[PDB]
C-alpha cells in the first residue's frame, strides 16, 4: 500500500553522503561534486572601476554649477595617472579604473557639452557608479560551497580565480546485474519462452550518464551458488548494487532467501503506476536496490527512486530530479484513483506560446515507446480519477537520461 | 540596421552539410550518438500471443456451459504450458505468458469465484479479450527508429529488445579549439601586468565535451604570425570545426585578421543581440570556423545560441538542438533597450498559486559570470521591446544540461 513520498524519505534518511575525494583539473570536473568550499585567493574586481561610459567627478566641483573641462581619459588598461586640476572632470569608460580622488561617475548621456566644458544634469550621490574592489567576490570568501555540482556555470569562475584543480568526491561505484533462464544476450537466437535482456542496458546507460562508475556483471546463471557469488563480487567493489531484474522483489523463491541470508533487506509495495514492487536494504558494504522485471516499471522505479539515492550518495546538496510545473491537458487522460500515476506526455506550446500536454498513447507497461515519444511525465495525484481536456495537471520534464 | 540572430543562424545552417561517415558501436556506447541508418525490426513484437492479465486462459464453449472449470495447468513467464489441455477445464496464466494452443480468451482473476469443483466466471467473455497478439506493437521489417535519431535511454533498450547488439552511428564531430594573446595566463602560473586567466577556452571545451564532440584543444597560441598560421593549418586539417575562444579578431584589424582573410573566406558579423555583438564565421579549406568575442558572457551566449545548433546539424541530428521557449510572467522589472534581442538571465520558479514565473538573477552586465550559476533560464526579450514591468508576459528558455 505504501507511498512514493514515504519510500523516498526512508531510503534517503538511511544513507550517508560519500566523502572520499580526489583532486582534478577543471576540464575533468563536469558533473562532479566539490568536496571542499572553493575560496577566492583574490578580489573581484581588482581595483575600483567605473560602471558606466561617462565622466569621473569630485563632488566639490559639481555643486559649483559650472561646466567642467575634461582634463583627460581613463580606459580599462591605461589609467589616468597625470595630475587632476580643480574644476575639471575625467572622461572614463565602463571597467576603467577610477582615478585618485574620484568620488562619483556620471553617465555620458546625463551631461551635456558646452563651449567651456561639460555640464551635469541630475544630482550626484557620493560613491555612485563605482564598482568597488571585491564587491563581486572578496578574497577569503566562499565562491562555491562543498556539495556543488560543477557545470559550465561554475568551472569558468573557478578558472578566472587562477585555480587549476579542485577536490571532488569520488564517483559512486554501482554494480549491476540481472538473472533468469529466459534472458538471452543480444545476438543469439530466441529460445523456448525467452526474451532479450533490456533493463540491464537501460540502467547501465542511466548510471553512466549520471556520472557513476559501473561494474556490469552480466546475466547471472539461474542457480543459487552463482547468485551468491555475484552478490559477493558486486558487494565487495561497489557502494550500491542493483538487480535490474529477476532477483525477487517479493515473490518467494531462492533469489529471495539468498537476499535475506545476505543482508537487511526490505520488500515494498508502492502506491505508483506503473511499478509497485521494489526491494531495498543494506548488504555488508553497500546498498541494494532490486528492480521489478517489467522494463517500464524498472525504468520508472529507477528514475524516481534510485536516481535520488545516488544523488545523495554522491555528495550533491541538490534535489537531483526536475521540478514540476502545473499545466493544461490537451488530452483526455484515463486514470484510476488509488495509485500515484507517472504517465508520459508530450509538452509543447499552444499558438499563444503557453505550454500544454498531450498524452503519447496507451499507458500500459507492455510497451516501452512512451519514453521515446514523450518528453515528460504527467504526475497525476494519487486520488484523482479520469481527467478531461483543459484540466490542470502536474508535469515533470524528462532530464537528459531521455533527452 | 544590424544583422539579426535568426538571419545569422540561418546563414550558418544553410551552408552546412551533415556528416555521413559512420562507425558501428555496441549499444552501451551509443548514448548521445546519431543513428546513421534506419533501425529495422528483424522480428514481431510481441513474438508469440500472450496475456494482458493474471487470470485464466479459457475457451468460449467451456464458459457458456454456465458451469465451473477445473484448472488443468499454469502458463508462466519464461515457462509455458506446452503439454495438452482437455475440454471443460481452464488454465492459469500470468501477465506476459504465451497463451496455450487453443486459447480463445483470458479473464482477469477479479471476474472469477474460486469454487470447489473448479473455477466459476463472470461478465460474459468477449472473443479474443486480453490477448495482445504477435506483432501488434511492431511488425517485422518496419522502421523502429530512423537515421538521424539521437540515441538515448528511451531508444537503446528497444533496440536491444529486438536482439540487436550494435548499430551504426555517425562519427563524432571533431572540433579544434584555441585562444591567442599575450594577455592570457594559465590557471597555474601567476598574473603579470595586464594579464588575465584564460576562462573561455575551458568553458567551450566543457560544452563541446558535453555536446558529445571530439575536442582538440591546442591551448594558448603565442602572439606570432607563424604560430597562429600553423595552428590554423593543423586545426583545419584535423577538424570539422575550428573555434577561437578569444583573441582572434572578430573584426578589429590586426595580424590575426589578415591571416584569417588569407586561410579562408571569413565574415565578420555584428549581431543585434546582447550580450555580444561581434562574431566571426566562414569556411577554411576543410573546416568551418567560428570566432568568438573575448568577454566570457558574450562568448558563452554566442557559443550557446549559434555554435551549438551548427554542431547539432553537422552531427547528423534531425532535431533542432536547443531547448524550447515558453511564455511566462515576470515578477521583476527588466531594464531593456530597443535595438537588440536581449538574452537576459533569470530564475524561473513556482509561486504560491503554482504558476511558473521569472525573476532576474540581478545585474545583467557582462562583467560578471554569476548570472549563469544563479539562473536557470534565459529571458529572451524581443529586439524592439523596451523595458518590462512586473506582470507582463515574457519568453523564457530553460538552460539545458550545460548549465544544470
b/e A355-382 (16+ beta carbons within 10 angstroms → b): bbbbbbeebebbbbbbbbebbbbbbbeb
CA distance A146 to A151: 14
Query: Measured between beta carbons, which residues in chain B are less than 8 angstroms from residue A187?
Result: 163, 165
Report the CATH number that the domain containing residue A332 is assigned in CATH. 2.40.340.10
- DSSP H helices, B27-140, are 60-64
- The total domain count for chain A is 4
| Chain A interface, best mutation among B206, B296, B319, B366, by max A CB count within 10 A | B206
CA distance A195 to B164: 12
How far does chain B reach from its first CA to its final CA, in angstroms?
36
Report the CATH number that the domain containing residue A283 is assigned in CATH. 3.40.980.10
CA distance B332 to B320: 30
Place of cell 528511451: B154
Neighbours of A7 (CB within 10 A): 21
Report the CATH number that the domain containing residue B143 is assigned in CATH. 3.90.105.10
Query: Measured between beta carbons, which residues in chain B are less than 8 angstroms from residue A194?
Result: 78
3-state helix/strand/coil string of A109-175: ECEEEECCEEEECCCCCCCCCEECCCCCECCCCEEECCCCECCCCCHHHHHHCCCCEEEEECCCEEE
Q: Which three cell numbers stand for residue B196?
A: 588575465
Closest CA to B398 of B340, B341, B328, B336: B328
Phi/psi-derived region of residue A174, left when phi > 0, alpha when psi is between -120 and 50, beta in every other case: beta
Name A131's bridge partners: A49
CA distance B44 to A18: 46
Q: A156 and A35 in one domain? A: yes
Q: A197 and A300 in one domain? A: yes
- What is the CA angle B366-B368-B371, rounded to 5? 95
- Side-chain-side CA neighbours of A290 within 13 Å: the count stands at 25
Place of cell 568551472: A155
CA distance A148 to B399: 17
Close Cβ partners of A33 (under 8 Å, ≥ 6 residues apart): A147, A148, A149, A150, A168, A169, A314, A315, A316
- What is the CA angle A305-A311-A315, rounded to 5? 150
Distance from CA of A122 to the nearest CA of B (A): 19
Closest CA to A157 of A47, A50, A29, A321: A29
Closest CA to A366 of B45, B39, B103: B45
Place of cell 595552428: B231
- Inter-chain Cβ pairs, chain A and chain B, closer than 8 A: 189
Report the CATH number that the domain containing residue A93 is assigned in CATH. 2.170.190.11
Technique behind the model: X-ray
What is the DSSP secondary structure assignment for residue B162, as one 8-state letter?
T
Of B153, B163, B325, the CB nearest to A206: B153
Distance from chain centroid for Cα A286:
24
Q: A380 and A301 in one domain? A: no
Close Cβ partners of A140 (under 8 Å, ≥ 6 residues apart): A39, A40
Q: A288 and A222 in one domain? A: yes
Closest CA to A243 of B385, B193, B211, A253: A253
Instruction: Indicate the SS3 state at residue B69.
Output: strand
Q: Which three cell numbers stand for residue B386?
A: 523596451
Query: Measured between beta carbons, which residues in chain A are less than 8 angstroms from residue B154?
Result: 368, 371-372, 402-403
Alpha-carbon torsion A306, A311, A315, A319, what sign?
Answer: negative
Q: A175 and A240 in one domain? A: yes
Secondary structure of chain A: what % helix, strand, coil (to 5)? Answer: 20, 30, 50
Q: Which three cell numbers stand for residue A254?
A: 531462492
Closest CA to A277 of A266, A267, A287, A264: A267
Q: A308 and A197 in one domain? A: yes
Closest CA to A176 of A240, A251, A84: A240
List Cα–Cα distances, A78 to A60, A337, B294, B338, in angstroms.
Answer: 26, 71, 19, 32
Q: B391 and B337 in one domain? A: yes
Q: A234 and A103 in one domain? A: no
List Cα–Cα distances, A73 to A80, A114, A132, A254, in angstroms.
Answer: 6, 18, 20, 84
Specify the length of chain A in residues.
403
Q: A402 and A261 in one domain? A: yes
Query: Measured between beta carbons, which residues in chain B are less than 8 angstroms from residue A400?
Result: 401
Domain C-terminal end among A119, A136, A153: A136
Strand order across the A54-57 sheet:
A70-74, A89-92, A54-57, A104-107
- Side-chain-side CA neighbours of A162 within 13 Å: the count stands at 15
DSSP states along B252-312: S-SHHHHHHHHHSEEEEEEBSEES--EEEEEE-SSSEEEE--SSHHHHHHHIIIIIHHHHH
Q: Decide if B138 contacts B6 (C-beta within 8 A).
A: no
Q: A191 and A107 in one domain? A: no
List Cα–Cα distances, B77 to A234, A254, A299, B80, B99, in angstroms.
Answer: 27, 16, 19, 7, 11
DSSP states along B168-235: EEEPPPEEEEEEE-TTEE-SSS---SS-EE--HHHHHHHHHHHTT-EEEEEEEEPS-HHHHHHHHHHH
Going by their DSSP bridges, the two strands B341-350 and B356-360 should be labelled as: antiparallel
Place of cell 511566462: B328
Q: Decide if A219 contacts A179 (C-beta within 8 A).
A: yes
Going by their DSSP bridges, the two strands A130-131 and B326-330 should be labelled as: unpaired
Name A216's bridge partners: A176
Q: A239 and A309 in one domain? A: yes
Place of cell 508502492: A270
| Chain B interface, best mutation among A76, A156, A203, by max B CB count within 10 A | A156
Close Cβ partners of B189 (under 8 Å, ≥ 6 residues apart): none
What is the DSSP secondary structure assignment for residue B395, as one 8-state letter?
E
CB contact under 8 A, A299 and B153: yes
CA distance A51 to A108: 12
Phi, psi of B226 (to 5 degrees): -80, -35
CA distance A378 to A397: 9
Torsion of CA B223, B226, B232, B234, to 10 degrees: -120
Q: Which three cell numbers stand for residue A374?
A: 514523450
Q: Which three cell numbers stand for residue B97?
A: 505468458
List Cα–Cα distances, A63 to A58, A114, A126, in angstroms.
Answer: 10, 17, 12
Helix (H) or strand (E) holding A177: strand A173-179
Phi/psi-derived region of residue B79, left when phi > 0, alpha when psi is between -120 and 50, beta in every other case: beta
DSSP states along B320-366: --S---EEEEESS-B---TTSEEEEEEEEEE-TTS-EEEEE-S---T
Instruction: Indicate the SS3 state at residue B313.
Output: helix
Closest CA to A403 of A347, A329, A324: A347
Q: Decide if A391 contacts A329 (C-beta within 8 A).
A: yes
Place of cell 580606459: A75
CA distance A200 to A206: 10
Documented resolution in Å: 2.7
Name B268's bridge partners: B280
Place of cell 548510471: A207
Torsion of CA B157, B159, B160, B163, to 10 degrees: 160
DSSP states along A191-249: -TT-EE--HHHHHHHHHHHTT-EEEEEEEEPSSHHHHHHHHHHHHHH-SEEEE-SSS-S
Q: Which three cell numbers stand for residue B68?
A: 465451473
Neighbours of A55 (CB within 10 A): 24
Cis peptide before B275 (omega within 30 of 0): yes
Domain C-terminal end among B137, B159, B193: B137
> Exposed, middle or buried, A15 (CB in 10 Å: 0-12/13-18/19+)?
middle
| Chain B interface, best mutation among A150, A180, A193, by max B CB count within 10 A | A193
Nearest residue of A to residue B136, measured between CA atoms: A367
Q: Which three cell numbers stand for residue A235?
A: 558487494
Helix (H) or strand (E) holding A300: helix A295-301
Q: Which three cell numbers stand for residue B203?
A: 568553458
Name B180's bridge partners: B221
> Exposed, middle or buried, B42 (CB in 10 Å: 0-12/13-18/19+)?
exposed
Q: Decide if B130 contacts B50 (C-beta within 8 A).
A: no
Torsion of CA B120, B123, B127, B129, to 10 degrees: -90
Instruction: Indicate the SS3 state at residue A387.
Output: strand
Distance from CA of B10 to the nearest CA of A (A): 22
How far does chain A reach from its first CA to its final CA, in angstroms?
32
Instruction: Indicate the SS3 state at residue B7.
Output: helix
Alpha-carbon torsion A149, A151, A154, A156, what sign?
Answer: positive
Closest CA to A93 of A56, A45, A67: A56
What is the residue range of A163's domain? Answer: 21-44+137-169
Query: Measured between beta carbons, which residues in chain B are less than 8 angstroms from residue A152?
Result: 203, 206-207, 210, 300, 372, 402-403
Q: B260 and B312 in one domain? A: yes
Instruction: Indicate the SS3 state at residue A56.
Output: strand
Taking each helix axis from N to C terminus, what angle separates A307-314 and A4-13, rounded to the nearest 10 degrees?
30
Nearest residue of B to residue A403, measured between CA atoms: B152
Nearest residue of B to residue A156, measured between CA atoms: B199
| Chain A interface, best mutation among B157, B163, B220, by max A CB count within 10 A | B157
Distance from chain centroid for Cα A261:
37
Instruction: Indicate the SS3 state at residue A312.
Output: helix
Of A184, A326, A368, the CB nearest to B158: A368
Taking each helix axis from N to C terminus, what angle separates B255-263 and B225-238, rounded to the nearest 10 degrees?
30
Domain C-terminal end among A122, A150, A169: A169
Place of cell 514540476: A324
- Side-chain-side CA neighbours of B355 within 13 Å: the count stands at 11
Phi/psi-derived region of residue A170, left when phi > 0, alpha when psi is between -120 and 50, beta in every other case: beta
CA distance B355 to B120: 53
Place of cell 557582462: B366
Closest CA to B181 of B293, B297, B298, B308: B293
Q: Decide if B9 contacts B306 (C-beta within 8 A).
A: yes
Helix (H) or strand (E) holding A308: helix A307-314
Name B310's bridge partners: none
Phi, psi of A310 (to 5 degrees): -55, -35
Q: Decide if B258 contacts B219 (C-beta within 8 A).
A: no
Torsion of CA B61, B62, B64, B70, to 10 degrees: 180
> For A52-122, where are the E strands, in sequence order?
54-57, 70-74, 89-92, 104-107, 111-114, 117-120
Closest CA to A183 of A175, A191, A172, A173: A191
Of B157, B187, B325, the CB nearest to A159: B187
CA distance A82 to A158: 36
Cis peptide before B399 (omega within 30 of 0): no
Strand order across the B71-75 sheet:
B71-75, B90-93, B55-58, B105-108
Amino acid at each position: 500500500l505504501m507511498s512514493l513520498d514515504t519510500a523516498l524519505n526512508e531510503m534517503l534518511s538511511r544513507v550517508t553522503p560519500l566523502t572520499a575525494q580526489e583532486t582534478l583539473p577543471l576540464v575533468q570536473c563536469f558533473g562532479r561534486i566539490l568536496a571542499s568550499d572553493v575560496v577566492s585567493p583574490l578580489d573581484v574586481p581588482g581595483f575600483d572601476n567605473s560602471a558606466m561610459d561617462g565622466y569621473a567627478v569630485r563632488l566639490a566641483d559639481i555643486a559649483s554649477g559650472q561646466p567642467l573641462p575634461v582634463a583627460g581619459k581613463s580606459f580599462a588598461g591605461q589609467p589616468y595617472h597625470g595630475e587632476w586640476p580643480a574644476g575639471t572632470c575625467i572622461r572614463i569608460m565602463t571597467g576603467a579604473p577610477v582615478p585618485e580622488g574620484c568620488e562619483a561617475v556620471v553617465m555620458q548621456e546625463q551631461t551635456e557639452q558646452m563651449d567651456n566644458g561639460v555640464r551635469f544634469t541630475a544630482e550626484v550621490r557620493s560613491g555612485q557608479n563605482i564598482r568597488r574592489r571585491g564587491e563581486d567576490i572578496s578574497a577569503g570568501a566562499v565562491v562555491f560551497p562543498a556539495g556543488t555540482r560543477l557545470t559550465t556555470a561554475e568551472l569558468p569562475v573557478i578558472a578566472s580565480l587562477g585555480i587549476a584543480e579542485v577536490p571532488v568526491i569520488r564517483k559512486v561505484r554501482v554494480a549491476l546485474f540481472s538473472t533468469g533462464d529466459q534472458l538471452q544476450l543480444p545476438g543469439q537466437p530466441l529460445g523456448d519462452g525467452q526474451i532479450y535482456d533490456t533493463n540491464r542496458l537501460a540502467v547501465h546507460l542511466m548510471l553512466e550518464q549520471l556520472g557513476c562508475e559501473v561494474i556490469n556483471l552480466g546475466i547471472i546463471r539461474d542457480d543459487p551458488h552463482a547468485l551468491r557469488a555475484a552478490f559477493i563480487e558486486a558487494d565487495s567493489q561497489a557502494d550500491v548494487v542493483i538487480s535490474s531484474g529477476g532477483v525477487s522483489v517479493g515473490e518467494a523463491d531462492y533469489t529471495k532467501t539468498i537476499l535475506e541470508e545476505l543482508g537487511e533487506i526490505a520488500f515494498w509495495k508502492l502506491a505508483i503506476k506503473p511499478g509497485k514492487p521494489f526491494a531495498f536494504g543494506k548488504l555488508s558494504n553497500s546498498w541494494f536496490c532490486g528492480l521489478p522485471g517489467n522494463p517500464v516499471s524498472a525504468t520508472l522505479t529507477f528514475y524516481q527512486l534510485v536516481q535520488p539515492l545516488l544523488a545523495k550518495l554522491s555528495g550533491n546538496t541538490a534535489s537531483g530530479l526536475p521540478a514540476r510545473q502545473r499545466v493544461r491537458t490537451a488530452s483526455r487522460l484515463k486514470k484510476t484513483p488509488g495509485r500515484l500515476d507517472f504517465q508520459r506526455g508530450v509538452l509543447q506550446r499552444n499558438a499563444d506560446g503557453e505550454l500544454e500536454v498531450t498524452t503519447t498513447g496507451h499507458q500500459g507497461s507492455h510497451i516501452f515507446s512512451s519514453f521515446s515519444l514523450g518528453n515528460c511525465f504527467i504526475v497525476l495525484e494519487r486520488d484523482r480519477g479520469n481527467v478531461e481536456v483543459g484540466e490542470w495537471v502536474e508535469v515533470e520534464p524528462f532530464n537528459a537520461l531521455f533527452g
